[PDB]
Each structure stands twice: as structure tokens, then as C-alpha cells.
Amino acid sequence: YGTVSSLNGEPEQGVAMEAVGQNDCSIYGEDTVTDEEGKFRLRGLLPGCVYHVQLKAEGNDHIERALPHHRVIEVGNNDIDDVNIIVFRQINQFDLSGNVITSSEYLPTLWVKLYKSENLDNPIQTVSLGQSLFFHFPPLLRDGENYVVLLDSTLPRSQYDYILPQVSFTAVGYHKHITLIFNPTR
Amino acid sequence: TLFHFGNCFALAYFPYFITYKCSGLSEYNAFWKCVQAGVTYLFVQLCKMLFLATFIGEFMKASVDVADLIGLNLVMSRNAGKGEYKIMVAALGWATAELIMSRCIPLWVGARGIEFDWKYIQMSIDSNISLVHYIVASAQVWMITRYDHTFRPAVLLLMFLSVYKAFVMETFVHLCGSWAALLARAVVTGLLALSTLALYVAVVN
Amino acid sequence: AHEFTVYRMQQYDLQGQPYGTRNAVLNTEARTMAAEVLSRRCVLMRLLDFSYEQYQKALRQSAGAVVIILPRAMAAVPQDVVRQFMEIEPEMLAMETAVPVYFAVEDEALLSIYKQTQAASASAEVLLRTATANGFQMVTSGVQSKAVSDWLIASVEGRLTGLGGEDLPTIVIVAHYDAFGVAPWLSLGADSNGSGVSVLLELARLFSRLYTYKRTHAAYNLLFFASGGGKFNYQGTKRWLEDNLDHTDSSLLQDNVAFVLCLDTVGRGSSLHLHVSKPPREGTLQHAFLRELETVAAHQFPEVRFSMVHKRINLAEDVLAWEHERFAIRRLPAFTLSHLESHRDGQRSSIMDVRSRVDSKTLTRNTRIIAEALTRVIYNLTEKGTPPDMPVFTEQMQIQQEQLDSVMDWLTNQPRAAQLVDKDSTFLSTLEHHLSRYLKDVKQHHVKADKRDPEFVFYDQLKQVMNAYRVKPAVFDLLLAVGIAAYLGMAYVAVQHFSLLYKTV
Numbered sequence A: 001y002g003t004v005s006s007l008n009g010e011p012e013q014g015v016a017m018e019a020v021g022q023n024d025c026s027i028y029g030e031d032t033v034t035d036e037e038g039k040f041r042l043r044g045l046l047p048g049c050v051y052h053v054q055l056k057a058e059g060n061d062h063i064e065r066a067l068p069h070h071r072v073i074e075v076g077n078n079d080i081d082d083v084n085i086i087v088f089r090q091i092n093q094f095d096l097s098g099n100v101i102t103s104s105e106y107l108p109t110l111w112v113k114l115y116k117s118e119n120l121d122n123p124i125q126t127v128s129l130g131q132s133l134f135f136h137f138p139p140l141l142r143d144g145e146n147y148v149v150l151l152d153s154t155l156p157r158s159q160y161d162y163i164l165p166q167v168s169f170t171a172v173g174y175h176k177h178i179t180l181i182f183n184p185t186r
Numbered sequence B: 001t002l003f004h005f006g007n008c009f010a011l012a013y014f015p016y017f018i019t020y021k022c023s024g025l026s027e028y029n030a031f032w033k034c035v036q037a038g039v040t041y042l043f044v045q046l047c048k049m050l051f052l053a054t055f056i057g058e059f060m061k062a063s064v065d066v067a068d069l070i071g072l073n074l075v076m077s078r079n080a081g082k083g084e085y086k087i088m089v090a091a092l093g094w095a096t097a098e099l100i101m102s103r104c105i106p107l108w109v110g111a112r113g114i115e116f117d118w119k120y121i122q123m124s125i126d127s128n129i130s131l132v133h134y135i136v137a138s139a140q141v142w143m144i145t146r147y148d149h150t151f152r153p154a155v156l157l158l159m160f161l162s163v164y165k166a167f168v169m170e171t172f173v174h175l176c177g178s179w180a181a182l183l184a185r186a187v188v189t190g191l192l193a194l195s196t197l198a199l200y201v202a203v204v205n
Numbered sequence C: 001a002h003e004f005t006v007y008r009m010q011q012y013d014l015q016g017q018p019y020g021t022r023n024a025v026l027n028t029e030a031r032t033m034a035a036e037v038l039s040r041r042c043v044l045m046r047l048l049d050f051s052y053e054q055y056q057k058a059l060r061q062s063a064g065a066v067v068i069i070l071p072r073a074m075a076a077v078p079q080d081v082v083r084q085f086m087e088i089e090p091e092m093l094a095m096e097t098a099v100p101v102y103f104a105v106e107d108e109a110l111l112s113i114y115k116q117t118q119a120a121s122a123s124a125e126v127l128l129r130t131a132t133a134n135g136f137q138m139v140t141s142g143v144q145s146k147a148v149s150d151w152l153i154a155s156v157e158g159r160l161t162g163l164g165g166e167d168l169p170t171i172v173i174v175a176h177y178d179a180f181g182v183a184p185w186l187s188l189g190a191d192s193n194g195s196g197v198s199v200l201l202e203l204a205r206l207f208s209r210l211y212t213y214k215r216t217h218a219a220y221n222l223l224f225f226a227s228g229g230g231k232f233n234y235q236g237t238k239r240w241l242e243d244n245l246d247h248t249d250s251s252l253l254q255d256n257v258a259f260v261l262c263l264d265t266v267g268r269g270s271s272l273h274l275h276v277s278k279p280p281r282e283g284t285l286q287h288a289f290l291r292e293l294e295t296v297a298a299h300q301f302p303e304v305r306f307s308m309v310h311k312r313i314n315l316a317e318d319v320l321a322w323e324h325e326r327f328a329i330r331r332l333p334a335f336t337l338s339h340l341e342s343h344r345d346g347q348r349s350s351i352m353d354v355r356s357r358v359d360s361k362t363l364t365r366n367t368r369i370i371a372e373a374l375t376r377v378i379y380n381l382t383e384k385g386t387p388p389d390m391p392v393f394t395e396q397m398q399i400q401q402e403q404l405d406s407v408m409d410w411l412t413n414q415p416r417a418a419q420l421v422d423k424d425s426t427f428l429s430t431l432e433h434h435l436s437r438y439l440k441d442v443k444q445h446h447v448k449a450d451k452r453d454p455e456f457v458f459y460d461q462l463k464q465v466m467n468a469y470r471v472k473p474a475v476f477d478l479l480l481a482v483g484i485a486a487y488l489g490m491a492y493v494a495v496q497h498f499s500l501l502y503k504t505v
């Protein structure tokens, strides 16, 4: 008998809600999908055992966390009230980033790449560094997808000597800060 | 360090003046002869530079030595008189040419400033020993000239082989300190000086 | 003739009174520390034996210049000497020393010249000393420092709109990216507010991630301000606060301004202190945020001791202590967060603040604490349940340790002194881009000088190149003159000697 709201206060809808018991009461417990208001109507009020409201493993794919994972509530000679849990959705973007360590004069002559692993000859993104030592490749999706960050500069070997770095950041996490280092000589 | 430049110039130029005043300059007024010798030395230096541009280190040194010997022989043959006096008009002229060359202009641009490297005093020392080295070269020229006995051509060939001793010693030092190298050059040049005076007392007849 | 690069001491002016060295020309011998005259002579000391009594003796003796040979590594130097050089710095800087002070970097030839000068300075003996008097002469290049009259102190500002309404409270976060040490070109400033601008950048990233999505879009405007012109009395904040208050009538700095956070030297250390100019009034937003901060620092991370520091505003000091002072002057709620406990501590400035002095773990923990306190106060969580025995930033929003490390490395990569970061330098451009990828309405405020009673006039010629010319006194060369006179006499005799020898045969 509480509410399941989001971080700001928006009432989440379609979130599975149940209460799993402990001790000998582990066999008792029901579930209830919350409504638009976030007012769940859990039933099965048996005293003598503490309850644990927490998010069902199945049927809750879109929703990532429940910040108060469990709420200890003492079941006395009455009902429970004011059980609020805040929840976060599952962000799917990757939000790539990463600085570049190089001299100032070499910066305008650089474009970082996003060569996909399966084909190192067909880049999918070519954000130019320009005058800023920070590239912010537009967000990607995260499911395996090994990538490359080959730093493809315009400076040829005819007047300078350099080696272009190559970084693989197989996308299973949530961020990355590739730090390509470009220090040409001669 | 202008006064350092003064001390180095006093070390270098003054012995030439001493030789000029102690060798009877008024006998020929060798100023014209010295100028002609310097012009010949400049021409020989230009020819050596052209040969080096056309064309390992030993060959360049040998060519430079041959050109210097030819110029000294021409200068000596330009005048007739006492053998010691043609010796003087050749050697002093060539030595003055060397001093006016790249052992006075660097002495001007360097030194006189704030830095002090012993290189300048070393250059002055080497310029002073170049006087006796060119004395030896002129002695070789005189042995070549003054008629053709008692294995004199063999001794002249030995002196010619011993010539380019400065380049030989420089190569040896490169293969082997700066002051140690200068001392070694001084001793070998002095040994050639004594060999040449021995040749002179042998040839006086 | 060695050609090393010497970085000069500070030459900034504030409110009209000068500070630091006021000379950038020297042409004297290099007489290191000895009982000799030491007047109008460059004095060479090494940081390993750089005592303050010795330095004050050098300055009082009117030396030609003072050159300090910093160790090349600047990290292998013993920590006790580092602490002593921390305690020497604020007193050394706050003076009108008319003798140039240059800081150099160790070199093999530098070690050789220092050794020779040390041997010659301390020490038949008189003539031998004159003969072997290898005392070098050091001369610099360029002309005297000229007052740069058109230096624009930069400032990067970015907004974050709330959920709905035109009266939302506007929490403000500021951080002065610059850091001045005893040498502007050597003032990397890693543990200084350069470790606070990194936390500000990470807070920007995290709150941008939280605000982009509707369901976590809280109704609290966040005005981030990576201010320039920092330890120089916080001019960048002064001009920004003046232009957003009295010149215009719009902008969020007047509507419903909530607490104004300020971050500086928030890196190393196991203690966090929230400094306030005046105590928070009970019930207001500042008191709520302070309660959230104390609850977080007492329940989530017990390893940090937390305590308010209430320093009353003082209008007599040269600088306004913290950064929240300039905000509290204009009747604006503000407080500063710092690992320090006393503003008088010289742990700031600190050319010694190399990158290896800000521990990444401590920086991450401090960022966690600050970000969680802000999240709890902003999102009204405290009166919603959510016991403080479990965090918000566990997964999918974890404070990126790699990002913090890379940002810190980039900040320390180049000097960040306010006199060297141009209005269009790649440091400022990269900072603006980084803030622009996460914020909205990012721009660049500038303060020139007000051109009347100059609030600040930074000077130039801070990276002069100095030449180590070998030289010997004229007495040596007089000895050489006597020698060459003897040589000339020997040569004069030698002509007649050889003539007699040839005659003898």
C-alpha cells in the first residue's frame, strides 16, 4: 500500500510488484501489476512475518533498478501504508566520449574514426576533432559490437613521421573514454 | 673578452712581424712577393675546393698538399737570389695567407664577446706552428729545386711522404684531448722541422 | 653555452598594488651561495637545499637574480622537502621583490655548471684562484616585462533547464580552472581547483544524463560555471555575478537562486569540509542540502569525517578566501566544498601539485559524495523514504573513474595559469566543447580590465630563455698576456739561436 514513482515524481505504469516472505513464510506471497497512478493493491495479509516488496525478475525487462531494492515492513495488528520505491528505466544509449593527447598544432589535421571491427574500410562515424581535444561520437547501441577508434589524420608521411593509435572498446558497458595519443616526430 | 682577442692576436700576428723584421725585408721589399704568394695560395685553395666538390679523406688531403707544393714551387721560381731568401718570401707569404684566411676571421667573430673557449688560443698556437710547417714545405720545394746526387731525390720523396703530417695526425687523433692533440701536432711538426734542417745542412754543398 | 628555459615568478597586480617579482632582465656572473659579495650577481640554489632564511638573505643582499634548479622528475623529490617548499611559497610570493626570480629544470650541463660555481664560489692561492676562476655568466633574452593591457580573463558558463515553469530555483556550481604557483609556467595545479573543475565536469555529465530523459528530469535549474580568473581574487566570478545582476535584468542569477556551490582543492585527502560564510538558516535550501550532505557522509561513506566550517567574511584580506565569498557578498546563498579545513593553509597554489598528487580513488569518492548530496536535495528524495544506507549512483550512472582520470590528465597536461590560458587557447576551446556536449546555452564571458583602476593586469615574459656563457676574469687573461710576451721573447731569441746552430752545423 504505497506508490511506485520515478525519480522526478512521474508515476510509473506496468511495473510488477510482489512481496516475498522470509523464514517459514517464504512460501507465501502474491504479485500485482501497478496501475497508472502507481497504486499497487497487494493482498494476502498474514501477520507474524516480515515482508519484502521488490521487483519481479521476469516481466520487468524495460526497468533497470529499484533504488530501495527491498523495504522491510513490520506486520503488526494492522495493515501497512506509505511504501514508496523509486525506480529507474533502462537507458540503452552508449554515450561515447574520449580526449586526445597531442600538441596544439597537430589538432586541426586530425579526424578520429569509428571503424567497425568486421570491416576496417567502411567507417560509420567520422567526427572531426577540429579545435577541441574531445570527441563525442553520437550515442551507439550496446550489444557486443567490437569497434575501433583508429585516429585517421590528414598529415602524410611525406613531411612527418607518426603512428596512428587503434583502440577496441567492445560495447557491453555504458561509457568509454578512449585516450588516443598522437605524438609525431621530425 | 675583447682583450682576450687582443692576447690571441698578439700571439698570432706578432711572430710574423718578428720574422718580417728579422729576415731583412728591405733586400727585396717582399710585400709585393708576399702579395703574389697570397694570390697564388688563394688560387690553389679555390682549385682544391673545386677538386673536393668534383670528388676518401686521404685523397683530398693529398690533392691539397700537391696544390700547395705546386704553388710554393711556382712562388719560389718566380724570384732568383739567395736560397734562404726565396725560402722566406715563399713561407712567410703562405703563412700570412693562412692567417688572413680562416684563422683570423673566426678569431674576430668569436672571442671579443662573453664566451671563452680555449679553441681560440689553440687556433693561435696552431697558426704559429703553421709558420714552421710552411718553412718545412718551402724547404721541400728548395730541395726539389736547386739542381738535381747522394740520394737527394730519395730524401725529397721521403719528405713528400712525410708531408700532410697535419692531416695524418688529425686522422690518428680522431682514431685515437684537444690540447693533447695540439701538443702532438706541435711535436710532429717540430720533428719535421729538425728533419728539414738536417736536410739543409746535408744539401748546403 | 647552455641554452635552457627558465620560468619566471609571478608578476600579477591586484587592485593597483603590485605582487611578485618586477624584473625580467639580468646580465651578471653566477655566484652561487657563498660568503662573497652576492650583490648584483645571479644566485643559483637547488630546491633540495632551498632554505627560507637563505632566500631572504639572498633578496636582502640585492642579488642580480635568483635561479632555482627544480628537479626534473618533480615527483621523486623527498616529501619532507615538498612540504617545506609548500610552506615557503605563500610568504615568498606576497612581496614586491624587485629582483627577478627564475625557476629552471635540472639538466646534465646544469648540474655541471652548478657544481663548478659551487666549487669556485666558496674558495700562491690567490694567483691560482685567478688562473682557475671558471665562473659562468648568465644572460637572459628579450625586454623587460610589459603590462599586458588587453588580457581577457575567460569564463565558461552552461545552463540546464528545469522541468516546467519560469520560477524554478537555480542551483549554481562554479569552479576556477586556473591555479597560480610561484611560477605561472610551472603551475600545473593538480590538487588545486584543477581537481574541482574535473568534479564539475563529471557532475555536468551525470546531471545531463539524468536531465535528458523526461522521467528523471527534476525541476531545478543548474547553472554550471567553469570560471576563469581564479586565485587572482576570483575576478571571473566577480564580473559574471556583476553582469548577471546589475547590468541586465534577465538570467537565472536573480529569480529564485538556491545555494551556490563552489568546488576547489577537492582531490586528495580523507576529510571533506563544507565551508560557509554565514550559517545556513534552518529550513531553507542550504540547510536541507547540508543535512543531506551530512547524512550521506555519515551513512554511505563513514571513512570521511565531515564538518561545517563557518568563517566570517573578512573585507581586509587581499583575496576573498574561498569562492563563495564573492557570491555571499551580493546577498546570494553560497558555500564552498573543499578537502581543506583552513583557508590560510598553503596547500593551494603549489607548483608542487603534480598530477600524481590527486589520488583517483579519493577524487571518485568526493565526486560520489557531492553528486549524491545534490541528487538527494534536488529530487526531494529525503522526504520520500530511500534510507541513506544505499546509494543512487550504483550502476548505469556510476561516476566514470576512467573519465575522471583522463580529464585530470588533460588538465595537468599543460599549465593552467590565468596568465597563459588565452581567450582562444585549446584548453579553453576543449573545455567549452566538453561543456557543450552535455549542457545548453554554453557561452564565454570575458572581463577585460575595466580600464579604470585596473582590477588586474597580468604581465608577460614568463618563459624567457637564458644563456649560460662561460667566462673568466681579466686577471686570468693578464696572466695569458705575460705568457704570450714570454713566448714572443722566446721566438725573438729563436731566430738567432737557429742561425747560430746552422752556422755551427
Ligand SMILES: *[C@@H]1O[C@H](CO)[C@@H](O)[C@H](O)[C@H]1NC(C)=O
Binding pocket: C380, C383, C384
Ligand atoms: C518536495 O519538497 C517540498 C519542500 O522541500 C515539500 O513541501 C514537498 O512535500 C515535497 N514533495 C513530496 C512528494 O514529498
